[PDB]
């Protein structure tokens, strides 16, 4: 416990009169240290479509996918850029599967698996739609939910299809994989998120999450609380460990396009022109219920921790850097990294992921993970069963 060398950043009001959420990002960029203040990027690439964002599980490479033709893998911290592909088919998402050397893009029809340089490795005959393209490196399993009812699991270690699960739910409106559990979460128009394992052809458990369609879903690091948003201007705080929505934030001004969860407990809600993050909102009490406005400054009622409004955009998606305190918000013209104080964890474990990794360390670690892949039957509702 005392070996833990680095401690989180904080944000403190210092008055009741002074307010926490009112800080702006140019105002933040004054006091943050120079490399960390400079780690906020403004990539306005206004020519192509709205931009999809994903950092790798280590923050070392950023992958972006504009809706029209852009596919871009930068070695994000440095000036290096690996991939810049212009496919005139339209794309939806992308993820690095194992390392920055191999990634996968979610196109109009077919998923593509791709080299760092931008070369074509593997076009999938299957995956005939691809809306959410997500990965779990602990099974080496690219799990993809298109606009189809089905859900496809490709084991890119072997390079073969594991399984394909028809939901009977229709087009997938959301998918968030569980880091702690590797159960997949699919969200559809009935207000229903289904938990999934590749073995079980019926879902593990269905959840009538909200009314209307599922806008998005996002899961804790601990796998305890998953924050779900419907298109009904509502966001539920599901505690998966006992399958209860802790708080039901009703009547947003606009339904959130996405939700995202940091490591230390931050929650990101992006209505699209606005991005708003709460601190410690996932806890058990309804005092920790995330609320927009606490009248009278009552400590029980909970205000948002950090706010932002995008002027000329309706942003697409967002994702924290997993070890740093920023979050990449993909807007129509591009990418902002909005600086949080305490979102990411300060003390990573190198033996799990390496944010500072040599290429020789990388090819050691890749072989280490491929030795430690699990075959797909081990995806279960509990890791420990």
């Amino acid at each position: 416990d005392y070996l833990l060398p680095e401690s989180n950043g904080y944000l403190e009001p210092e008055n009741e009169l002074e307010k926490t959420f009112k800080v702006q990002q140019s105002e933040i960029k004054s006091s943050v240290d120079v490399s960390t203040a400079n780690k906020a990027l403004d990539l306005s690439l206004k020519e192509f479509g709205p931009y999809h964002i994903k950092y790798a599980k280590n923050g070392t490479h950023l992958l972006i996918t504009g809706r029209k033709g852009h596919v871009a893998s930068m070695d994000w911290r440095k000036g290096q850029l690996r991939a810049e592909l212009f496919l005139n088919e339209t794309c939806h998402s992308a993820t690095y599967l194992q390392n920055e050397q191999y990634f996968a893009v979610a196109q109009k029809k077919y998923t593509f698996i791709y080299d760092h340089e931008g070369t074509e490795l593997h076009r999938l005959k299957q995956h005939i739609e691809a809306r959410h393209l997500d990965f779990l490196p602990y099974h080496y399993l690219l799990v993809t939910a298109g606009e189809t009812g089905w859900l496809k699991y490709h084991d890119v270690s072997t390079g073969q299809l594991v399984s394909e699960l028809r939901t009977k739910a229709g087009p997938t409106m959301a998918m968030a994989q569980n880091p702690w559990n590797a159960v997949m979460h699919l969200g559809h128009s009935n207000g229903t998120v289904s938990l999934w394992s590749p073995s079980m052809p019926e879902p593990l458990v269905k959840l009538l999450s909200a009314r209307g369609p599922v806008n998005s879903i996002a899961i804790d690091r601990s796998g305890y609380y998953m924050a779900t948003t419907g298109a009904d201007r509502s966001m539920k705080i599901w505690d998966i460990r006992n399958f209860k929505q802790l708080h039901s934030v009703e009547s947003l001004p606009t339904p959130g396009t996405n939700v995202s969860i940091s490591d230390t407990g931050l929650l990101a809600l992006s209505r699209g022109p606005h991005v708003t993050l709460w601190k410690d909102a996932l806890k058990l009490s309804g005092d920790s219920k995330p609320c927009f406005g606490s009248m009278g400054g009552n400590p029980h009622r909970n205000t948002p921790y950090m706010s932002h409004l995008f002027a000329g955009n309706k942003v697409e998606n967002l994702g924290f850097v997993p070890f740093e305190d920023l979050l990449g918000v993909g807007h129509q013209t591009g990418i902002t990294n909005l600086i949080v104080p305490g979102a990411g964890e300060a003390n990573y474990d190198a033996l799990e992921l390496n944010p500072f990794e040599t290429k020789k360390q990388r090819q050691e670690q890749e072989v280490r993970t491929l030795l430690n892949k699990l075959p797909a039957d081990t995806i279960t509702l509990d890791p420990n069963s």
Binding site: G118, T119, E120, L121
Partner: peptide, 25 residues
């Protein structure tokens, strides 16, 4: 100023050394 015949450069089966059939020479 883009060159003509902008083609999809993809995996060469006869040139990529990552292939173990071209791991020999």
């Amino acid at each position: 100023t883009r060159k003509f015949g902008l083609v999809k450069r993809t995996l060469n089966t006869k040139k990529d050394q990552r292939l173990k059939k071209n791991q020999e020479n």
